[PDB]
Design a protein around this ligand. Structure first.
Ligand SMILES: O=C(O)c1ccc2c(c1)nc(Nc1cccc(Cl)c1)c1ccncc12
Length: 329
């Protein structure tokens, strides 16, 4: 049915040794070369600890993984190996496991993040352009390697504001794109879920990540976190519909032959498109420009095939100051 409009054939060209994570053989490192110092975070899927690589006395992260499905371990490790050297992708340092339990751990680089709720309001207009551009380099890189992140959100984007460095982290939901594959629609955080996930459209692609980027960008320039605040998955679609409008939703549904679940009959009304300018306020207007609105408009589309590619997104006039400043060094 639907096929990605860029990078559709990447996994075809690279072959089984790139994407066949089921047959991954890990060359496990020495667990005793690492010392766990302090827990920094817990996920649904993991626990993250500040650690030391003892031989070099260097600071690093140990991410202990306990998913009920083992192939999710292999998938995360294969993608992290494949993205080696990628710009702004979190660096894999090692993979180790407990000798008795066989519980695996991923070792990554440590990043001194400032939490996004503190960090995002301190950004200038230029900072938003700059960090979105850096995030675009990581998404263009993984898409060009046949990989969808599927969990793009502020929590998975680590920024060292002092060093002006960015890392896209937590590749645990990431997956290889294979033309015509039916993917699980139970991916991403509710506020960052694309319409395709909300209406059970399974033939999605890299363009899912561009919707999620659009939700992050909206929250940064309008200072509303999260931008689409649904109380549940059905409500998430209503919140989107109350901004993009029900007219563009219905042609999209017709275009991809999607039938809405009967649950939407009572809760989904007819809404006109709310123009982007209505979200402009005294507090957020320092982020706002016609280039910014134009950029956001071209990310937040129902139709995944209408959204900018990460590569098109880097060519947008919004990033002209960032491209100019980079050209000065
Ligand atoms: O998943 C990864 O690849 C992943 C990779 C690197 C980090 C991480 C998650 N989580 C961090 N912190 C964090 C903060 C709150 C909750 C959770 Cl679970 C974790 C963190 C901190 C400093 N440097 C690197 C990381």
């Amino acid at each position: 049915r639907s096929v990605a409009r860029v990078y559709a054939n990447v996994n075809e060209k690279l072959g089984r040794s790139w994407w066949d994570y089921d047959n991954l053989v890990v060359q496990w490192g020495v667990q005793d070369n690492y010392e766990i110092v302090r827990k920094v975070g817990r996920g649904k899927y993991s626990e993250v600890f500040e650690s030391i690589h003892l031989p070099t006395d260097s600071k690093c992260i140990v991410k202990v993984l306990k998913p009920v499905k083992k192939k999710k371990i292999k998938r995360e490790i294969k993608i992290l190996q494949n993205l080696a050297g990628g710009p702004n992708v979190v660096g894999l340092l090692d993979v180790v496991r407990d000798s008795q339990s066989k519980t695996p751990s991923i070792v990554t680089e440590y990043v001194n993040n400032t939490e996004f709720k503190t960090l995002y309001p301190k950004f200038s207009d230029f900072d938003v352009r700059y960090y979105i551009f850096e995030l675009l380099k990581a998404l263009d890189f993984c898409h060009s390697k046949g990989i969808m992140h599927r969990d793009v959100k502020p929590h998975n984007v680590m920024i060292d504001h002092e060093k002006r460095t960015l890392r896209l982290i937590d590749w645990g939901l990431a997956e290889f794109y294979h033309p015509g594959t039916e993917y699980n629609v139970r991916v991403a955080s509710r506020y960052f879920k694309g319409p395709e996930l909300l209406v059970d459209f399974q033939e999605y692609d890299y363009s899912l990540d561009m919707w999620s980027l659009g939700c992050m960008f909206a929250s940064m320039i309008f200072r509303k976190e999260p931008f689409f605040h649904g109380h549940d998955n059905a409500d998430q679609l209503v919140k989107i519909a109350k901004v993009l409008g029900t007219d563009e939703l219905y042609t999209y549904l017709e275009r991809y032959d999607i039938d809405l679940d009967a649950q939407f009959d009572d809760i989904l009304g007819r809404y006109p498109r709310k123009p982007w300018s209505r979200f402009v306020s005294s507090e957020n207007q320092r982020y706002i420009s016609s280039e910014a609105i134009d950029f956001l408009d071209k990310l937040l589309r129902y139709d995944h095939q209408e959204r900018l590619t990460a590569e098109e997104a880097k060519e947008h006039p919004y990033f002209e100051p960032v491209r100019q400043a980079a050209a000065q060094a």
